[PDB]
Amino acid sequence: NAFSSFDACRTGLLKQQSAAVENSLVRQNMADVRAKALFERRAVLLDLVEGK
Amino acid sequence: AASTIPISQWPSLLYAPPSSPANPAVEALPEMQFDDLHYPRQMLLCRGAGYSLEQCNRMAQPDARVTPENPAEKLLKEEAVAAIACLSQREGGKDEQCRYYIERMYKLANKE
Amino acid sequence: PFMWRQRAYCAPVPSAFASQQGVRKPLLRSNSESLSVFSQIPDGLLGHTTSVTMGNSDIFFLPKPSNLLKIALPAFVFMPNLTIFTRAFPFYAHTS
Amino acid sequence: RLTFFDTESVALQSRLRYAEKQKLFHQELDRELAAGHIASLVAEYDPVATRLPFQPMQDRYRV
Structure with missing residues (x-):
């Protein structure tokens, strides 16, 4: 009766x-x-980014 | 008269509080219990036995190991019902309109 | 063994959380050892430190020139004379 | 004195052996308590966090 609860x-x-x-x-x-x-999205956004 | 209780005397203050117009049952304060592990433990035991969540929720029952019930609710039943009727009719016993029943109950419970 | 984050006196020493160290010293130690005197220090000369005795140093000598004095001096009574009236002493001791 | 008039030595030796037993008991007790404190951390331990992204989990970290 106690081993049942233990198990x-x-x-x-x-x-x-x-x-x-x-x-x-x-x-x-x-x-x-x-x-x-997110990393791939950032990659495409960096390919699209513009400036210098 | 009522002097400050330092922090070292708080454990005794919890189980032997000072006198107040509305005191608790100091002899029963060690018997006040409310288990926060009741349902978690019940679910754990049932899931270990092998039941499902639905079966466990259907077999679950509220805890019986809670603070005991006041024996006055069973011994002074009729007097309490009469006092509550008096209150409901007389606006809560304003200007001492249920003193009769309240004093009967107080005497029955205290006996000088 | 119930409130570990709140009972730091029963917690292991910070050197135990470090995962690095004939017979070696134990890896696991508690702060509760601070409550014992001889936990870390040895018990050497434990029951032999109250045995190192040194003698007193008082000298009981004082010249007693009586040629300087010609009068008697008062003297105390230290005990009641039990050699006389021995049987009545408990009965007359309280008087004066 | 030591050959015919000494019992303090025996009494103190007995008391010191008693003290040794007491010391070792306390030591073991404190060790057990600290071990239980450390065992309380096995619940926080998560062996999946050791996993590297896009790699399988190792049985080395007690799956």
Whole structure:
């Protein structure tokens, strides 16, 4: 009756860790893609810029 | 008369406060509880058991480990209802219009 | 073991967060050791420091020239005479 | 004196062994508390942040 609760809390922590890893990966990848897109936009704007 | 309480006497001030016209139950102050971990812990345990979020939210229940209920609400029920009726009818007991019921309750609860 | 960011006396020393250093010294130490005297210093000569004794230095000598004096001097009574009226002492001690 | 009239030495030796036990106990206790403080940081630790952009994650950082 006590090992049940212990195992429940245990599996909860494990699931927390897995979900954290997955969500962090997703967020990181989205941010990196956005940064790359911004870099390309800046490249085209520098090709279009004018002055001296 | 009411002298300053230094910061070192605050822990005792919390569980033995000075007298006031509206005092709390000092004997019950160690029994006042309100768990901020109730629902997080419930969800964690259920998800570890293997249930889904919807099942967890349907099985969730509010915490019973809260501050106990006042026994007066069960012992002085009729007198309290009568006092509340008097107040509702007499504008909150202005100019001592519910003194009757209030004094009956006070006597019942205090006994000199 | 409940409020770590608020209880710094129970926290590790800053040399522990550094990840760099026969037998070696321990890598993990706490600030709570400051509350012990012999934590870091040794206990050498611990129960032998109260044994280093030095003698007193008073000399009880004073010349007693009585040829200078020709009169008696008053003297104190230090204890009651129990050799006389021994049996009644508890009964007459409070009088004068 | 030391051969026939000494018990303070034995008493002090016993007390000093007691003191050694006490010292080691306190030391281990403080070490354990500091270790728990450090363990409180494993929750903040995020092994995905070690990942380089557009590269796979390494099991070396305890996936």
